[PDB]
């Protein structure tokens, strides 16, 4: 016998929090001519250039999806190319992030990544986790499903350890086990036409508003981003 | 621990069934006469979806966030639903859907309760659409129950940290695979509010500005075409 008692056990304007599903470099390489991988060249500047436009808004949270935890399943070829030009990215972009006082957290599962990739994360995670601007945290090899089971994991260890009991397990418990914790997202940005989640944040989109946008990311600006803003307004004075 | 080098017609739709309040507003209607009509236009959604070769339908009716409201309007919303329940499932066996429940059942009204189990037994032979209800339930609820139930099985001996996994999850939550292909969400509103969290991995969203008693065949025609178009 486990219970439920949900009448009982009671329970995270600008967007404080926002979520960035970054698509369409493929497609905004095919568009233009080139080959499929210069698109993503333009990926990790476009998200530091949004981070300053946001910060200047006074949003105080952005989590961007990076590296899904399905690209394992493209080829050893394009997987390997991604982690590469990516742990490149982020050290062109480090300083410009850090200098203007930007706070930088990587989720994910970072014991399958490169050692160089690993060694570059937290030092990156150590220099910078004392500045007061921006968080700005990183969904690297990350999915939806992977932090709802780490939780888990963690929580199934600890009853074993006699440190806490079955009924003890809410909604505030499981939350300070996630990776990705409280204030969710009040807002979530797709770009490039699709209008799915794609397994990136299961549990923290329960209260989310969804805005759905064609741009590609790389023609992604501040009016498109100013846009969504005041569509995300509008939305607050239609609802209680 | 920790390592991930496998963790056309919808066959499965979800629904969020919002806009009655809103509907019987702009009709000078009592504020919950609009909720009268939603398991009838529920039944008639089934029918054309079981028409379309549709195979499953999961509806929310009753959020584990209603717990918040005045105590009067729980105490009609949950005698609202036994009074709808129990006029529409015999029409609804003889369309031949088959009908479950998820959610808290132990916190209903035990004259619900009764009427649920009926509703399940006359129905399970049934080999039409799968109508599965969602009544005292939630994204959050469904996780936690599931997270329980697994940390009962390691502390009784019967499995280990590393043996959880993406099927074991799957197995222990009430709504399971196969998950959502569509989501509908009819008034307006582009948010789940905490229907379903694991199972909408990867469901496409629909959403539109039609009021629930207001949703119609063509309405439902444009939703599957514009699934279709992607």
Excluded at 152 to 169: P, Y
Excluded at 195 to 208: E, I, K
């Amino acid at each position: 016998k486990i219970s439920c008692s949900l009448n009982l056990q009671t329970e995270c304007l600008m967007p404080k929090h926002i979520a960035l599903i970054m698509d369409g470099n493929r497609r905004w390489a095919k568009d233009k001519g080139l080959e499929v991988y210069e698109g993503h060249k333009h990926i990790i500047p476009k998200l530091k250039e949004i981070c300053d436009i946001s910060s200047k808004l006074g949003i105080q949270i952005i989590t961007a999806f990076a590296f899904s935890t399905e690209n394992w399943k493209r080829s050893k070829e394009e997987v390997d190319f991604l982690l590469s030009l990516f742990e490149r990215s982020l050290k062109t972009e480090f300083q410009n992030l850090a200098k203007n006082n930007v706070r930088i957290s990587i989720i994910g599962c970072k014991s399958d990544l490169p050692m160089t990739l690993q060694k570059c994360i937290a030092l990156t995670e150590e220099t910078t986790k004392g500045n007061k601007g921006l968080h700005l945290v990183i969904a690297l090899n990350y999915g939806g499903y992977y932090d709802i089971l780490q939780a888990t994991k963690s929580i199934v260890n600890k009853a074993m350890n006699g440190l806490l009991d079955v009924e003890d397990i809410n909604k505030n418990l499981f939350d300070q086990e996630l990776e990705s914790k409280c204030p969710n997202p009040d807002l979530l940005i797709r770009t490039g036409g699709e209008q799915r989640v794609s397994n990136f944040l299961l549990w923290q989109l329960a209260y989310t508003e969804f805005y759905f946008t064609n741009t590609l990311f790389p023609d992604f600006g501040e009016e498109d981003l100013k846009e969504a803003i005041m569509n995300f307004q509008q939305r607050h004075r239609r609802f209680g």
